[PDB]
Amino acid sequence: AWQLVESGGGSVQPGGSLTLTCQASKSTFSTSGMRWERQAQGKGVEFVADISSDSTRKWYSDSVKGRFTISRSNWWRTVTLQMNDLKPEDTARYYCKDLESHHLRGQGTQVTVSSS
Amino acid sequence: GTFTWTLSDSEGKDTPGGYCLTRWMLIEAELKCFGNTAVAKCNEKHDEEFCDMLRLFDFNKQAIQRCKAPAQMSIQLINKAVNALINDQLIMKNHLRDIMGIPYCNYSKYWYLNHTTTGRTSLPKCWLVSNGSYLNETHFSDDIEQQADNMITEMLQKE
Amino acid sequence: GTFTWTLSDSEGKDTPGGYCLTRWMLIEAELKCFGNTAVAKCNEKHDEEFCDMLRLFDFNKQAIQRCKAPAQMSIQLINKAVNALINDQLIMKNHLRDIMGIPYCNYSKYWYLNHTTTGRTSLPKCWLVSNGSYLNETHFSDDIEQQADNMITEMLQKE
Amino acid sequence: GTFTWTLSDSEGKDTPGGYCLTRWMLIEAELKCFGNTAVAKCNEKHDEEFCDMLRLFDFNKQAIQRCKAPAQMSIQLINKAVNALINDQLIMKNHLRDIMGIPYCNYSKYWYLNHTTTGRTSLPKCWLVSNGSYLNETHFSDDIEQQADNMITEMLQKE
Amino acid sequence: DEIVLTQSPATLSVSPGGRASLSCRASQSIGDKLSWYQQKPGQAPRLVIYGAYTRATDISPRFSGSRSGTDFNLTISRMQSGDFAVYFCQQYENWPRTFGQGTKLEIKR
Amino acid sequence: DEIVLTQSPATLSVSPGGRASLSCRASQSIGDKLSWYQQKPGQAPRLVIYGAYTRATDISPRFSGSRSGTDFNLTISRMQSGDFAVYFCQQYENWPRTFGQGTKLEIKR
Amino acid sequence: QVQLQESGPGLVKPSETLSLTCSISGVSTRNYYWSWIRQSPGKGLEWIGYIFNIGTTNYNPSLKSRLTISVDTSKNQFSLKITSVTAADTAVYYCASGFEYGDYTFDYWGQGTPVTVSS
Amino acid sequence: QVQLQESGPGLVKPSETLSLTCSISGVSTRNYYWSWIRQSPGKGLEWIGYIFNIGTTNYNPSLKSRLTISVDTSKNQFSLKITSVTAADTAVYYCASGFEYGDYTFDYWGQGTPVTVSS
Amino acid sequence: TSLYKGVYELQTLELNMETLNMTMPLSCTKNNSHHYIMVGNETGLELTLTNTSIINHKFCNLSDAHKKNLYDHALMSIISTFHLSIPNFNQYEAMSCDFNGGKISVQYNLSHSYAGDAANHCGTVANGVLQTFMRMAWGGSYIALDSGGCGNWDCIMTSYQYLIIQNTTWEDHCQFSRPSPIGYLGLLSQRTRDIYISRRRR
Amino acid sequence: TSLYKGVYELQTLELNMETLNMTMPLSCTKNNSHHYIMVGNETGLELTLTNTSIINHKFCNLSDAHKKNLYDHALMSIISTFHLSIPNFNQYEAMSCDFNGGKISVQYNLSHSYAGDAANHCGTVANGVLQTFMRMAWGGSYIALDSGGCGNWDCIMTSYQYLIIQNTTWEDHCQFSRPSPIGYLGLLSQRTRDIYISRRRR
Amino acid sequence: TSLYKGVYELQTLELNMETLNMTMPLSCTKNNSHHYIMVGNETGLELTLTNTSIINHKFCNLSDAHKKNLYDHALMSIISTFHLSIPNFNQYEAMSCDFNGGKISVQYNLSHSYAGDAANHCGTVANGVLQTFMRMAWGGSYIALDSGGCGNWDCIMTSYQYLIIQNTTWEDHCQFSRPSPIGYLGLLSQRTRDIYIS
Ligand SMILES: *[C@@H]1O[C@H](CO)[C@@H](O[C@@H]2O[C@H](CO)[C@@H](O[C@@H]3O[C@H](CO[C@H]4O[C@H](CO[C@H]5O[C@H](CO)[C@@H](O)[C@H](O)[C@@H]5O)[C@@H](O)[C@H](O[C@H]5O[C@H](CO)[C@@H](O)[C@H](O)[C@@H]5O)[C@@H]4O)[C@@H](O)[C@H](O[C@H]4O[C@H](CO)[C@@H](O)[C@H](O)[C@@H]4O[C@H]4O[C@H](CO)[C@@H](O)[C@H](O)[C@@H]4O)[C@@H]3O)[C@H](O)[C@H]2NC(C)=O)[C@H](O)[C@H]1NC(C)=O
Ligand SMILES: *[C@@H]1O[C@H](CO)[C@@H](O[C@@H]2O[C@H](CO)[C@@H](O[C@@H]3O[C@H](CO[C@H]4O[C@H](CO)[C@@H](O)[C@H](O[C@H]5O[C@H](CO)[C@@H](O)[C@H](O)[C@@H]5O)[C@@H]4O)[C@@H](O)[C@H](O[C@H]4O[C@H](CO)[C@@H](O)[C@H](O)[C@@H]4O)[C@@H]3O)[C@H](O)[C@H]2NC(C)=O)[C@H](O)[C@H]1NC(C)=O
Ligand SMILES: *[C@@H]1O[C@H](CO)[C@@H](O[C@@H]2O[C@H](CO)[C@@H](O[C@@H]3O[C@H](CO[C@H]4O[C@H](CO)[C@@H](O)[C@H](O[C@H]5O[C@H](CO)[C@@H](O)[C@H](O)[C@@H]5O)[C@@H]4O)[C@@H](O)[C@H](O[C@H]4O[C@H](CO)[C@@H](O)[C@H](O)[C@@H]4O)[C@@H]3O)[C@H](O)[C@H]2NC(C)=O)[C@H](O)[C@H]1NC(C)=O
Ligand SMILES: *[C@@H]1O[C@H](CO)[C@@H](O[C@@H]2O[C@H](CO)[C@@H](O[C@@H]3O[C@H](CO[C@H]4O[C@H](CO[C@H]5O[C@H](CO)[C@@H](O)[C@H](O)[C@@H]5O)[C@@H](O)[C@H](O)[C@@H]4O)[C@@H](O)[C@H](O[C@H]4O[C@H](CO)[C@@H](O)[C@H](O)[C@@H]4O)[C@@H]3O)[C@H](O)[C@H]2NC(C)=O)[C@H](O)[C@H]1NC(C)=O
Ligand SMILES: *[C@@H]1O[C@H](CO)[C@@H](O)[C@H](O)[C@H]1NC(C)=O
Ligand SMILES: *[C@@H]1O[C@H](CO)[C@@H](O)[C@H](O)[C@H]1NC(C)=O
Ligand SMILES: *[C@@H]1O[C@H](CO)[C@@H](O)[C@H](O)[C@H]1NC(C)=O
Ligand SMILES: *[C@@H]1O[C@H](CO)[C@@H](O)[C@H](O)[C@H]1NC(C)=O
Ligand SMILES: *[C@@H]1O[C@H](CO)[C@@H](O)[C@H](O)[C@H]1NC(C)=O
Ligand SMILES: *[C@@H]1O[C@H](CO)[C@@H](O)[C@H](O)[C@H]1NC(C)=O
């Protein structure tokens, strides 16, 4: 019920500054953790970002090592990703899932990187 | 856990205490009512399935008989008292018996001792059911006899 | 005191293991005190809204100078001691009673028995209050009778 | 027995009035078993260490006779049997003690009072143990005093 | 006494998955002490509605009833399976219990 | 009063971490009332297997036994440490409570 | 559940006694309101009269009166004894009772066998 | 746990009395099956006898008979009394019992002490 | 009937769990599959374990349907409780939803990576769905669901390829078993909020 | 008063819940609206149910209020507890704030245009605000009730359009009901994890 | 035991929690760094707490544990419950595994960020692990203070760096405490109701 919908992606040229968003529900947002995953075509999901409760440790995977920022906000119950320096590898369908079994992954947002 | 509904304290037959159900609530049976002393064992909580079902039936009496009609399936209020009416652990215990093949309590026909000449209806326990229909009433004869002898123990308190 | 905020007894009468309430916390009231079987029974049954209320009264009384003595309204202190002082299930239960009209006690009025022979008191159960003011001792006289009968049984223990 | 699990099979060899254990389930003790109201108290209490541990023993005996465990260790079986068998809050209740505090209970040994003229017994409470081995039998003398007196109270019921 | 009643004249034919309006008129201030029974070709009668509105054991929620003081009405939400059969309305206020004449629920052509 | 106790005469030395097959044959009606005892050089013997083949208090899980009516076998799965010692089998169905000659577990060179 | 089977002397001629035999199985024979009902083509159904315990035995007040329905409280098998059989008396009879106690249910219903007036 | 200690007369003469004294510490005496066992070189162990409470005191049927094992229920210490010591009696003695109640375990084994026939 | 002790007599009563329709759900099963959750007296659910499939797209949209309120929203809570009650799902590719069109119909892709037939690894969308299905419908879960037994209940194998939900209305349900509220209450009771249950509960 | 059983005499007590002033908030209702939470004895919150709007909508700033830890920020954890406990809160534009100027001002949106759902259906942004409002200011809450007992517990829609929070100071409030801290504890007790390791005996 | 009240005699019993083998795990401790989760009588687990590490790569193939048909899964269903029960767990770089080769070995980098329980908040891969993994070792718990203040008490840590879960069959450990299932049961009932990644 009221899964973690996500929106903000699109087809943009390399080097842009695009922002993403993801809402929640069920009044379980200040204690339960959350993740972010990308599913490149031809391969399943892979860990991208993770943050638990109030921001304590919010690093990313080794394949990224920091190119955007995750900063949840109890009150307004949303999480936003601000990314820069696009590379063709990031092209994939992102996901917005919660650690606790309280919701399900968003419908999916596709981002394409291409000079043409 | 614990600290849940006591009882509605209906005025059904002739007394302020005691609760019972009408014919339509039961199946293939008439109107039956137990004594206030018999249901007093349910007022103080225990792990007996029948006591919870009386709580389950009690809520329906309060939420329909003297409640307005928001008839959109009214699923909203049950989640508030889900841990209150039905014993959370007792139902799980019955689930274990289901896969073991043990005769398990499926919230159905109940067996109770009735004392013709008085009306001292013991509190009904659960008639456990196995794969092949209910038990044949003899697989737990000793269990019934315990209640029958326990009534004589309760006789001493009465007299 | 694994979870409950244990009640630190006030010497009051002498040292019988009981709490003493002062004039400036009860409206239209004077000094009273309690003893054995009053605060001791709080640690066993937590139905008693008074016992949960007592913990809040006791803790804040100590909290002015004991665990901490700030002038910062002590909001952070009990923010990490919410469950110890009172049971969330009980206070949520009164709300479940409020919704469907069955009378509930809003932690304001209490009643108890007190004989003039030995002066022993009864653990004051919360007085259920409906829309039409509090009950006038007639709608729950049966519970009063039970406590009076229960007091006699406790007298056997003393004897 | 404890009125749990496999109905009328919580008996060691022949005991119909309760549960009888075996030496291979005990350490440094032979043919130590209880009966009558001593074991039946578990349903009334259902929150004490011995009863929770006893249920696991019952769960073991009736899960080994059947379920045809093919050396798989049946770890999948306990995946959803913790709630119905043991009081998950009771071990959590113990969780508030062993953190540099009062002597705790690791379900190792239990104590009870035995009447060596007729065969009466009482439900046991686990021996509280601390860092410095078990207690010296004098730390909780009052705990056994009330238990010893409680037997006289139950003797009145027998009389 | 007799306590006569005519209900539907001869038959209230209903197409499959339709709606039924079986009735039973009381010549006296019966009140609510009325019941409805059904009888198929073959088999033996079994009750469907008792009391006035109360549904019977193991009967679908479709069956129901109405009370107008004297003009009782039994309704079916939608016909299904082989529920085409005869119906009787029974009165049990006074001691000399009397059943209805009987109305046959034919099948529409 | 004798009950012949033939328990693997001489010795049954095994390689470290190997498997031992200590036995104790019964010539009279004993059934399943046989216990085993283990004695180190010095100290006093301590029981290892009581009843028929059930592990007693303490004792590593490796120790186990088998029953064949008259042929009783003690089995060691994975020996470790200085388990090399003497072993005995005892009968207690009757009341002579006799003991056996025993067997010494030597160490492979 | 209660299972009921009855049998009767189908060979009947005018002005002789008729006695069905309803069978009660798997249930007691006291505190039950056993009733007799018959279905006659050309007419509706009539309530012959219940038998309760061993006492009150009301017989269709003012319609036939004389019905003399007795209950054998020894093997749980009652019967009927009609008097002055007429041509119109041909019908199919049944035996039935309520939910173990009552008067306005008639759920547990018998199989039913016919009787015809022949000569 | 039950702790046992023993001290005995290491000096012994052929054909005279011999008495050990097994010690019981921290445990009562009644309801315990105290037993005597000895080990002699060149031969296996033999169960010398058991003393239970004050009555049944069976002394190794048909092997030695005269053992006169006694229990002193004053300081939790029992003893032995041999007669006609022979050369084969040179052995090492032990005192043990079961799990506080029983007759087929012999778990708590004492330290023991050797005794030799000397002249 | 059979006297016990002579002084006392045995009596039997059965409770009809159809009055509990306007306050809580009720669950019944017809046979061999196809369980139900009847709420009120207008609508219903469907729990069918079938070899066939109804969904043709690998997508699941819930929020969009909710905003337009294409459904009564009473039955959605049952689906939400059923879904999240699944332990260790972690694979939403199998899940599919077709709330659009006014009819609720979700479906699960059950163990199609030879996870239930060839070998019961039961670690990939094989036991979690069935484990919830056990508690959801009591319904004598020993034939109607292909329970098996105590043989690694965390790995329950079945030959049914898909689980299908629909919005069936009326076909005279509840044949094998009487309607029961306990099946749904238990999953909801275990759910509640699953946060503390602390203090002094016993 | 009346004497029960002769020996026993009944007496009643009324707890003046005023000693709990410098430790926890106290909730009360005056006559018909303006539900107040009191902390510090010098200032308090102001929960009013009115048709008119107060704040200029949008730009509800949060990071700008992080400078103050207490001293007009102590009465913010109550607001944070109030907001974080609202069930089914989806959209950001359903509430506005005017924290700038040294005063706290929070305005809630009770679905100003109900035509979005065209009824009292669920899923609306401010559907749980009225649910949690009763708990916060229990006080024998008969303000948002339409007489009787059980009425539309979940998914309530009231004629009032906005809930406004302010920082009123003192005008001798709490007429209809006495101050009550039980309401605040319940919400705070359901949104925190804490322990009370055994200090005294047992 | 001692005589109390004369009429009644005190007695004691000791339950041998060793028949609980083929239905649930059993936990113990050897000495100050070891905790063996006894399961059955053919396999087992070990928990070495030593300053020396064993893992050489910062990769953990949890899927390979289940996607490769490695050492019997009877060991599995216990490893999963461990890392799921950690509260406020968001540090995965510290964690590592060596499931490859049928030699399952999970390791944690405990508080390698200078330790010291930070300053005020202790939720940095320090309190969640030890407190939860100590509950597996429920018998006996005293290693340090916490300065919890007037509220909760969840900052009891030590200076150890590495916690490992080897696949040793061990050599009849559990000398300090007898095997018991209380330690594992506490883990199962706490927070083990969802597997997202953990
Ligand atoms: C889901 O659960 C609900 C639970 O409520 C089920 O509905 C309930 O069904 C029972 C059936 O026994 C009803 O009890 C009986 O009700 C009739 C009156 O029927 C009319 O009124 C009902 C209630 O309405 C009251 O209030 C309105 C105003 O709000 C007034 O206008 C009315 O007059 C009433 O006062 C109403 O529900 C009825 O609807 C019927 O039809 C619809 C459509 O098909 C069905 O859905 C309904 O379920 C229902 O069948 C109808 O409009 C009473 O006359 C009966 O009286 C007996 O019981 C009294 C105690 O309640 C007792 O005091 C009486 O003396 C009498 O008992 C004695 O006499 C009887 C015969 O005279 C004997 O049979 C009996 O043994 C005894 O000897 C009876 O009370 C509930 O009212 C009804 N409740 C509601 C809210 O509808 C529903 O069926 C379930 N659905 C499913 C799918 O499972
Ligand atoms: C707890 O556990 C108990 C015990 O398991 C459950 O009790 C069961 O309740 C259900 C529902 O009430 C019972 O099913 C009903 O049974 C009736 C009786 O019909 C009998 O006679 C039929 C012939 O006339 C016969 O066919 C029936 O079934 C047998 O035959 C079929 C083949 O036809 C075979 O497959 C079966 O295995 C049987 O051998 C039965 O013997 C039945 O009529 C019901 O079906 C329909 O009935 C009417 C007919 O018009 C219809 O209107 C209804 O809507 C219904 O659809 C229904 O199947 C079941 O029999 C009970 N168990 C036992 C052992 O008797 C109890 O329900 C559980 N609790 C809960 C809450 O569920
Ligand atoms: C739990 O639930 C119970 C009941 O359900 C609550 O008990 C209620 O407590 C409040 C506060 O203590 C009580 O309100 C007080 O009532 C007194 C009594 O005065 C009476 O007589 C007056 C004439 O002398 C009369 O005016 C009063 O009000 C009437 O008139 C006004 C118009 O003026 C009208 O609006 C009312 O509806 C009445 O018709 C009343 O009848 C009153 O004196 C108190 O005065 C308040 O206001 C003055 C203003 O200056 C202030 O100075 C005072 O300090 C005080 O603040 C106050 O209104 C209420 O009566 C109790 N209910 C019952 C049934 O007795 C209990 O509070 C709940 N718990 C908690 C924790 O709140
Ligand atoms: C929120 O709650 C807090 C409680 O935590 C309230 O703050 C407390 O106020 C009291 C006093 O109001 C402080 O303690 C006392 O201060 C006295 C000095 O002030 C006067 O107090 C008395 C006035 O009250 C009298 O009249 C009223 C009726 O008008 C009676 O109902 C009442 O019972 C009194 O009879 C008078 O004594 C006099 O006017 C004083 O000048 C001190 O004198 C007093 O000494 C007492 O100390 C003992 C402990 O109370 C007591 O047993 C002795 O008998 C002795 O009398 C005491 O120090 C509290 O310190 C203060 N709390 C805190 C935490 O500081 C606050 O008012 C309340 N807010 C609201 C809005 O209600
Ligand atoms: C179910 O229980 C019955 C006992 O009534 C037993 O006979 C049967 O073997 C069990 N198993 C099945 C599949 O019926
Ligand atoms: C008011 O209180 C009375 C009790 O006296 C109660 O019956 C009623 O439902 C309440 N509400 C209204 C609107 O009267
Ligand atoms: C309640 O009792 C009081 C006397 O104590 C009386 O004045 C009042 O009228 C009674 N009210 C009702 C509703 O009985
Ligand atoms: C050990 O236990 C004793 C009491 O038996 C206690 O005084 C002491 O503080 C504990 N700790 C140590 C380190 O001795
Ligand atoms: C320790 O306990 C034993 C119990 O047998 C007692 O005899 C001894 O005196 C105690 N010693 C101390 C120091 O408490
Ligand atoms: C009742 O509501 C009105 C709003 O129109 C408000 O002005 C008034 O103060 C309220 N009454 C109170 C708070 O007693």
Author numbering:
A (entry chain D): 1 to 116
B (entry chain b), C (entry chain c), D (entry chain a): 260 to 418
E (entry chain I), F (entry chain L): 0 to 108
G (entry chain E), H (entry chain H): 1 to 82, 82A, 82B, 82C, 83 to 100, 100A, 100B, 100C, ...
I (entry chain B), J (entry chain C): 59 to 206, 206A, 207 to 259
K (entry chain A): 59 to 206, 206A, 207 to 255
Paper text:
The surface of LASV virions is covered by the trimeric type 1-fusion glycoprotein complex (GPC), the only antigen available for virus-neutralizing antibodies. Like other type I-viral fusion machines, the LASV GPC refolds from a metastable prefusion conformation to a more stable post-fusion conformation during cell entry. We employed structure-based design to engineer an inter-protomer disulfide bond and to append a foldon trimerization domain to obtain a soluble ligand-free LASV GPC trimer stabilized in its prefusion state. To gain insight into LASV neutralization, here we develop a prefusion-stabilized LASV glycoprotein trimer (GPC), pan it against phage libraries comprising single-domain antibodies (nanobodies) from shark and camel, and identify one, D5, which neutralizes LASV.
We were unable to interpret cryo-EM images of D5 bound to GPC, but the addition of human GPC-B antibody 8.11 G led to better resolved reconstructions, enabling determination of the cryo-EM structure at 4.7 Å of our prefusion-stabilized LASV GPC trimer in complex with a single D5 nanobody and two GPC-A 8.11 G Fabs. D5 bound to the apex of the GPC trimer, forming asymmetric interactions with all three GPC protomers. 8.11 G bound to an interface between GP1 and GP2 subunits of single protomer. Despite the heavy glycosylation of the GPC trimer, antibody 8.11 G navigated through the glycan shield, contacting four glycans. The asymmetry in the protomer interface extensions was matched by the protrusion of an uncleaved furin site, between GP1 and GP2. This resulted in two internal cleavage sites and a single protruding loop, disrupting trimer symmetry and inflating the radius of the apex cavity targeted by D5. Residues within a 5-Å footprint of the nanobody were encompassed in all three protomers with buried surface areas of 730, 620, and 350 Å2. The asymmetrically opened conformation, defined by the binding of D5, revealed an apex site with little steric hindrance from the apex glycans. We also note that although the native cleavage sequence near the D5 binding site is not present in our construct, D5 is able to neutralize and that binding of the nanobody would sterically occlude the binding of matriglycan.
